């Protein structure tokens, strides 16, 4: 084409002709500049004063191709650093994009959905500003069809991704009323069968379940948990990862919220998550298990009935370090809230030897956690007089050595608790 590899000054020259077609040629040239793999000259385009011009081409209904090329170019500028996105926002692009959502041309309205994604994705300020200019209704209106399958699927993947950026980020979280407004549509996309729509829906739901409990409540009350759990079942890691993150958020809430996930079947998928060959899934599953072990006795009991304690012993014994840390926490939590039977059982599954092994990590915080894991367990062995039998096993497998040495460690809690234990059970 005659619009390949132009110079910025050419683009300026055409954009300042007063000839709508030359403007179009030069805007298409800018767009192609801005779409190239290595290092598009975003700043020059910005310094040349192009943004107000592009922005005002958005409003030329009479001339749809220029609407589209300007949309795309502005999209790609807005895809840069914050500073580059501020330039696009500062040119007035937001209301002008919101207007293109109504375009009769699907390829143009799709480009506007996409640009607004890049803006909202910068941060909660821009996100909340896209929201204030009215974007949500017309976005939601685009999905108001009896069956999502009839929409082109590039199109649907865009809207979903955009919607999920309106759910994203955190100081502050998105406005409650915006959330209520978006949710029914999330719930529907979360049942659609495109893997990418599903990944992005789960991501939205994870962004919404990362805060305080009223926020989690809003999501739980929509009844998406069963569906999350099924997605947790999914063979595509790009779906499992966000599903697992949303499950994980949700069980940081109340016991009653945690129970919906237990009720939903979640614990049956754990054998497999806790042995997942993706390190990250294994970490997050463990993290999730640790907030389930911080619940009620009868919840700890379900972790027991599902056969998950061996999988924690497993993870304590061999996984990557950060996953072992989370496992330690699952253990300490289990040992605080557990009955005696339960804590006994945990010992019979073989928790002591791999717990001691970790005692020799250079991570000062894991050691504290392990320390009252032991402590809590000693505690329960007192209530059945078994401290002997217990002290022996700890002795038997290198426990006592590392422990005693602990005293000679720089810490307030470390040396206190180690010395304590030794003075209490090993003198």
């Amino acid at each position: 084409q005659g619009t390949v590899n132009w110079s910025v000054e050419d683009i300026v020259k055409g954009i300042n002709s007063n000839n709508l077609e030359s403007q179009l040629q030069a805007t298409q040239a800018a767009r192609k500049l801005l779409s190239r793999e290595k290092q598009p000259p975003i700043d020059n385009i910005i310094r040349a004063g192009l943004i107000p011009k592009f922005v005002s081409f958005l409003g030329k209904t009479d001339c749809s191709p220029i609407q589209f090329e300007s949309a795309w170019a502005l999209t790609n500028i807005a895809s840069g650093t914050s500073e580059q996105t501020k330039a696009v926002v500062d040119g007035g692009a937001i209301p002008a994009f919101i207007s293109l959502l109504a375009s009769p041309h699907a390829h143009i309205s799709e480009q506007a959905v996409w640009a607004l994604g890049n803006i909202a994705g910068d941060g909660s300020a821009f996100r909340d500003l896209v929201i204030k200019h009215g974007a949500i209704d017309p976005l939601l209106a685009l999905l108001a069809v009896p069956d999502l399958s009839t929409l082109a699927c590039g199109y649907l993947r865009n809207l979903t991704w955009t919607l999920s950026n309106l759910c994203r980020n955190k100081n502050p979280a998105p406005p409650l009323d915006a959330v209520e407004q978006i949710l029914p549509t999330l719930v529907r996309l979360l049942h659609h069968n495109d893997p990418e729509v599903l990944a992005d829906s789960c991501w939205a739901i994870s962004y919404l379940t990362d805060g305080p409990n009223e926020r989690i409540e809003m999501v739980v009350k929509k009844g998406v948990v069963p569906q999350l759990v099924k997605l947790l079942g999914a063979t595509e890691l790009p779906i499992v990862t966000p599903a697992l993150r949303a499950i994980g958020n949700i069980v940081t809430g109340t016991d009653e919220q945690t129970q919906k996930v237990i009720d939903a079947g979640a614990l049956a998928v754990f054998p497999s998550l806790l042995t997942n060959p993706k390190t990250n899934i294994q970490k997050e599953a463990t993290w999730t298990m640790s907030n389930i072990t911080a619940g009620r006795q009868d919840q700890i009991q379900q972790v027991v009935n599902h056969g998950l304690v061996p999988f924690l012993v497993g993870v304590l014994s061999k996984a990557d370090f950060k996953t072992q840390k989370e496992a330690a926490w699952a253990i300490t939590n289990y040992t605080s809230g557990g009955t005696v039977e339960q804590i006994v059982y945990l010992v019979h599954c073989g928790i002591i030897e791999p717990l001691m092994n970790l005692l020799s990590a250079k991570d000062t915080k894991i050691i504290q956690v392990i320390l009252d894991a032991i402590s809590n367990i000693f505690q329960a062995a007192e209530k059945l007089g078994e401290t002997e039998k217990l002290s022996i096993m700890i002795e038997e497998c290198g426990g006592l050595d590392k422990i005693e040495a602990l005293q000679r460690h720089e810490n307030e809690s470390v040396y206190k608790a180690s010395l304590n234990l030794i003075e209490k059970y090993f003198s």
């Binding site: 779409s35 994604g117 994705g121 910068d122 994203r168």
Partner: peptide
């Protein structure tokens, strides 16, 4: 599987 892009460019 992994994070969702914050921003994306429509590419060549």
């Amino acid at each position: 599987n992994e994070g969702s892009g914050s921003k994306r460019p429509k590419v060549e």
